Amino acid sequence: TTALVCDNGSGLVKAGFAGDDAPRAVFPSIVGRPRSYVGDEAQSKRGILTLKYPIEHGIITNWDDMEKIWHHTFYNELRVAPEEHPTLLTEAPLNPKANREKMTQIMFETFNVPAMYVAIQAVLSLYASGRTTGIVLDSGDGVTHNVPIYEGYALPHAIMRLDLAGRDLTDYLMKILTERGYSFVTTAEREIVRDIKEKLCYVALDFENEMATAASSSSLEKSYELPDGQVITIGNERFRCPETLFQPSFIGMESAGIHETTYNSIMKCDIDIRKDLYANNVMSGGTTMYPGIADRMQKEITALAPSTMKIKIIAPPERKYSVWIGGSILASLSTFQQMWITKQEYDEAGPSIVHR
Amino acid sequence: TTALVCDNGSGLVKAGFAGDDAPRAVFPSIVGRPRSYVGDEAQSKRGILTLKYPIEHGIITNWDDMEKIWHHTFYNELRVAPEEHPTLLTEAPLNPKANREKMTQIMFETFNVPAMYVAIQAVLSLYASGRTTGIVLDSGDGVTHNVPIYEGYALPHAIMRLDLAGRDLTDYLMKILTERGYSFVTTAEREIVRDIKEKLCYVALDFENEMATAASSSSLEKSYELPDGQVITIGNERFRCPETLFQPSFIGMESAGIHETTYNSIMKCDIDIRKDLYANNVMSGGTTMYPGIADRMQKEITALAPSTMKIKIIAPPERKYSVWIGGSILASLSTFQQMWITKQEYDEAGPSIVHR
Amino acid sequence: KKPIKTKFRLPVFNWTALKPNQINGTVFSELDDEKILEDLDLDRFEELFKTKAKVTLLEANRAKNLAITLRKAGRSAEEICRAIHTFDLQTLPVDFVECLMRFLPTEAEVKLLRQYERERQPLEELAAEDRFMLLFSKVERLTQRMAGMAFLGNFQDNLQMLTPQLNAIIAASASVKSSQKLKQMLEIILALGNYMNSSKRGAVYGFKLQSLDLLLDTKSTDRKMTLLHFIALTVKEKYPELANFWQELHFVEKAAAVSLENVLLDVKELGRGMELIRRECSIHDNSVLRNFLSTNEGKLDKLQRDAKTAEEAYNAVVRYFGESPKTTPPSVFFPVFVRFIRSYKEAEQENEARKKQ
Amino acid sequence: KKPIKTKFRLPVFNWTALKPNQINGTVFSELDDEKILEDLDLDRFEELFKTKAKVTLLEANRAKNLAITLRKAGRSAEEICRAIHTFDLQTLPVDFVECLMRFLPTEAEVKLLRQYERERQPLEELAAEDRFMLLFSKVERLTQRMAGMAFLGNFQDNLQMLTPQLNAIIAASASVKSSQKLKQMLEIILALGNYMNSSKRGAVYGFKLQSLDLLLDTKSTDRKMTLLHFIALTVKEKYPELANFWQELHFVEKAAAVSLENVLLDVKELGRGMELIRRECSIHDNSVLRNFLSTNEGKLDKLQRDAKTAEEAYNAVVRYFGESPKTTPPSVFFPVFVRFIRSYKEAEQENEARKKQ
Ligand SMILES: Nc1ncnc2c1ncn2[C@@H]1O[C@H](COP(=O)(O)OP(=O)(O)OP(=O)(O)O)[C@@H](O)[C@H]1O
Numbered sequence A, B: 001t002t003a004l005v006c007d008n009g010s011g012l013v014k015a016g017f018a019g020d021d022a023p024r025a026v027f028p029s030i031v032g033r034p035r036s037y038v039g040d041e042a043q044s045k046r047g048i049l050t051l052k053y054p055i056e057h058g059i060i061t062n063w064d065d066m067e068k069i070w071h072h073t074f075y076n077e078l079r080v081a082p083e084e085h086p087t088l089l090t091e092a093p094l095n096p097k098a099n100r101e102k103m104t105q106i107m108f109e110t111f112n113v114p115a116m117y118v119a120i121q122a123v124l125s126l127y128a129s130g131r132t133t134g135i136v137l138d139s140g141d142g143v144t145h146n147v148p149i150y151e152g153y154a155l156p157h158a159i160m161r162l163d164l165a166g167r168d169l170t171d172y173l174m175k176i177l178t179e180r181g182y183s184f185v186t187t188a189e190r191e192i193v194r195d196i197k198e199k200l201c202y203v204a205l206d207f208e209n210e211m212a213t214a215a216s217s218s219s220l221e222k223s224y225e226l227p228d229g230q231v232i233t234i235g236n237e238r239f240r241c242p243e244t245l246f247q248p249s250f251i252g253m254e255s256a257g258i259h260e261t262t263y264n265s266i267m268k269c270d271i272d273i274r275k276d277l278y279a280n281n282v283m284s285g286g287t288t289m290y291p292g293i294a295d296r297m298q299k300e301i302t303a304l305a306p307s308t309m310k311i312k313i314i315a316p317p318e319r320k321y322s323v324w325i326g327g328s329i330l331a332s333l334s335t336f337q338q339m340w341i342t343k344q345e346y347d348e349a350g351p352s353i354v355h356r
Numbered sequence C, D: 001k002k003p004i005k006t007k008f009r010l011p012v013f014n015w016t017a018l019k020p021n022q023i024n025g026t027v028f029s030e031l032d033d034e035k036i037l038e039d040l041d042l043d044r045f046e047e048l049f050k051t052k053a054k055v056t057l058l059e060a061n062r063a064k065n066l067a068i069t070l071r072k073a074g075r076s077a078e079e080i081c082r083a084i085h086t087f088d089l090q091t092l093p094v095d096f097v098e099c100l101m102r103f104l105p106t107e108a109e110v111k112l113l114r115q116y117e118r119e120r121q122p123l124e125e126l127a128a129e130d131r132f133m134l135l136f137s138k139v140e141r142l143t144q145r146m147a148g149m150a151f152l153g154n155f156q157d158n159l160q161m162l163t164p165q166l167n168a169i170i171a172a173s174a175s176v177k178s179s180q181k182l183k184q185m186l187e188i189i190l191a192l193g194n195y196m197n198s199s200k201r202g203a204v205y206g207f208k209l210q211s212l213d214l215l216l217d218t219k220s221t222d223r224k225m226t227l228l229h230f231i232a233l234t235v236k237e238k239y240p241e242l243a244n245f246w247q248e249l250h251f252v253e254k255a256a257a258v259s260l261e262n263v264l265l266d267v268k269e270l271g272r273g274m275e276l277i278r279r280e281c282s283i284h285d286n287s288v289l290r291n292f293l294s295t296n297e298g299k300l301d302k303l304q305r306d307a308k309t310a311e312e313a314y315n316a317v318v319r320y321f322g323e324s325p326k327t328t329p330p331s332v333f334f335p336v337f338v339r340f341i342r343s344y345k346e347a348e349q350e351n352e353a354r355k356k357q
């Protein structure tokens, strides 16, 4: 029996079979309804339907649309019979015991699954790097977290939720490409702007130092080819966009940037384990994808910590999917097997069995 | 020897002679310079000069313009010789010991004063109501504070600075009168909009309940007569403006409203004195002027405190000037006399004598 | 040694200077200002940088404070001590009694006053405040007369605020405890959810009160209605009289907001205070203490029998619904029902508007 | 007693139910579901609400953790124990040594393994992880061989980071301490401000270092320049060689950022670690411990003489400028100068651009 792994993202469902490679079913988590349709299809029929966003920010909010998600995941992309395969879904950090409890209930009652598990995404990401202790920076489409973890357990009041993430950075690149004269504010064709963000732009090691080079190097700026014939160019705004991570103030937030969030997260934690936290520090998810973000982070934390502090950033080449892979690893893990919840024991204890 | 009392406000210098009645010299604290002129004159020559705002928000920032202020205060409005009269200036809460120290230095060295004192405005306000203990809500033009005070001493880490105040409420009334179709966005003639705010509009006891009456009563709305011939009318936006105090979100702030600010200010304080803090609660300054604000406040705190909690709001009819009067009271006070700083002892200890 | 001339008064430089006993081990005794005499040309310096040329026995702060208080008073020290002797039968201003109470002299500053009255003649050479404090400590039983006066001015406004809370707990606690249309609703729930929850997990004879809150929680397979909606339709159909049922419980919202432990100990404190009043009035006032105690002691007694029945009533309901009154306050207990009523009410609005179309 | 039928599997209702021993005192034993049989009509209910129808000796968490670790390893328990025996002369992966170190067996779970090897035959019926742990505790002196291997893989990168901080303190500490063009500047200040500060307040032979910071502070009567500006002009005129003077101090910015107490105790720890290496290598390895210890002990010694001189150098400057090295770190001390230089530099830019325009 192949088990199943579903990572439910603020912008994206990343899902597929355990036995680690990658999720082969990855789609925008969106629910369209007549003024039901799920995924990229909803992007296509957009405006004829009103898209609702169940997993926006951290937590699954309205459950009905979520059901629509898991149905489409199972029955369409994944193309399986949920009755057959034990399923592992992920959850945001700080996710409340009732969120988790109604997840399990929808699993067993709606999809008829044999067994299941709900696991904390940023612990899966720390698993995929071969670690049981450390601090993850999990940065997605809609949320960001700094999750301290010790002996597999994420330390509850350590976690710092930044409400800034990839969709917001896409918005910022809209704003600042417009200021450069480029013409797309359109909620349709902005689906190309994102692409720019993903293909070219990056994180400066020293911001102003690189924005001193604003016009100096012509090969500092890059050439972007639109899907159709026409082509355009991208200047300094390139590195200026992911900068918003470290300086949230760019979009107007009064929250700390990253390195801070990271830092006082570590600092919330017990004095002993602090060392191990700095040493093992794992960045995960598609907004941790910008080139050079690891080193910039590195220098910026080396700044906050003492002189003698061993500080390492672990930024895996495959980390866009970090959680999900840590999912596969965990599901396919053998000693994990006894920890699965089953219909037997849910029907025994009800949804509140989900606590371990 | 008549002493002098200068209250340096975020928008307004309230100053005059001790022996309490009221400041007879009250002018906008603004410094014009050629692209020097101080006060309402700067309002008149506006745009021909660039107005700088030394006391905007809490603290005196640029001192040169401040010197211009005190010179105009002394030599023009007040029409005295500073060498002659001991002077009492006020200061924001949390004002840093160097701000205070250079105040004193400018006093003795630039204006040649015989003696002086710097006192914390919101303690003067609590003095003018005959109290040495309690919590002031001092709300001015540019800042707002909740200042806990025990035995005359303001408790330093209690004080909560809200960056919202009267100028901001004047802006809000601009925004929401425009939404009603009225045509003045002008940074000149908006000096009438403020007037509306001051003469008519007020604080609802239950917001929505009163905005349910939005169009019901015609005598709920009031008739406003412009300076010239034409006349206009004011609807719900009337009570909607001071609401921004209790709901900062209206302008877009993520800061607590008032009652909260008040409350966790009290709650920052030692458990014993809490009682005395709720019991004696003094509102002061021209943004505490809106009719009914005292009772609204009252009900809103009675909400947060326990059942049996004695909670009294002191909102004096003369409190627009509260601090300044508490100033007169203090300067004219006899046992205050030994507490004055003098040139003898400044020239002995230098500006760091200002600490008591 | 050797200070400078200073034609013009240079601005103080606020540097923190080193005492010469520290100076020895440092860079600072290497070389001196003795080279620097003309040199830099002190003249254009000084032209460029030029500026423009009774007795208290109370600690001064305490003094200032007192002054600020009495200034507001308007009353003389004599008027005041006369008032405390007569129990503010001259203008009882409880506020002012309250402020004043903090300024009661400590024995430490009773020492500075005491023989130093008889010794010399500080009188009329004494600061107003010190004189006041003297005459203030002159009043016999000062502390207790103060307390008494505070108590007196407060008592009315006191049970003004204390009574209705006691009432609102009493009212609500019983109207809930005694409602049949409630016990009915609950028993329908027990049924329906036992039906659901049986065949596995067992079957149970009752549920802790929290349960009510997940009602809206578990929806229809349709997803269009909720359980609560269903219980509503099932009420309007099979059991129509219950469709109101909230109207049998009353002060529950108001009783939620009561913090009762406080209310009780406030009552007890009032008790000790009355006792002080009678103890003082005894030996001896006796004017206007009697004139209070009579017209009051029965009011106090009503508050006390209402406290006892309030407490007993509330403990009764809590234990009646399964919870622990020792561990739960009204601020938790009652809102459960509030939320359930508010929701139920909300439910039928939808159950109604759905039937319309 | 008496559960229901359940044709369709109704959703669990998650209510928290009351145990019948609690049920007695409550509303819940008044009346029951026995009235409610058909009534509400269970049929359209259930139509409306229907849903769709080896062995471990390690605690399971610890187990899971270990697994996640070794899975990343790729190495067998045998390869691994062979490596710890040979001191990772088979592929030394210090990271993995570090992770693994936490999983060292506690004596408590040495008990579960120990005789329960000899007793029965858990072997091949043992979970991979438990087997690994067995063979893992099989390694003699496990804890210390681990420690040693950690130490070894770390030492290079260690003094890689430790040395230049020790150097930067040393450099900066002395370049400051030993600069004449500095002592000069300071002495001009002492003069100028003593001139100011005299005729009242006295005259003083030196000032604590903080003083430097309020230089920009006290302006001209003109308000157009500052004191620092003036000292700058006075330098360019009367004492031109000093107009650079910052160029005589060097690592001060870098040395500011050094947290020295840490650096020293890190050095001490390194010492204890080397001692562990020699103690182990002694009795007995001896391969590749010797091959380390030789090529290292001199490097370590250089770090140690550089620690001693770093500490002595720094204490020297701090005391030299009046402050307490016991109470002040470089993170405070050096930025004083930094700010002053940066400002001085900033000052002359204005003193220059003013002369032009
Ligand atoms: N190379 C890249 N450069 C920039 N942004 C990227 C890159 N790859 C992916 N992204 C962005 O990352 C965001 C989605 O990240 P991700 O899907 O990991 O988060 P999520 O699914 O919402 O939550 P989680 O991190 O828990 O999975 C999208 O906005 C996408 O544009």
Ligand SMILES: Nc1ncnc2c1ncn2[C@@H]1O[C@H](COP(=O)(O)OP(=O)(O)OP(=O)(O)O)[C@@H](O)[C@H]1O
Binding pocket: B007, B008, B009, B010, B011, B012, B013, B121, B138, B139, B140, B141, B142, B143, B166, B167, B170, B194, B197, B198, B199, B285, B286, B287, B289, B290, B320, B321, B323
């Ligand atoms: N009747 C009134 N209603 C509403 N606002 C008023 C009224 N009278 C004055 N104000 C407002 O008060 C503000 C200024 O108050 P005030 O000058 O007392 O405070 P400040 O100058 O900020 O400093 P401080 O707190 O020291 O007094 C102005 O912005 C004005 O709009």
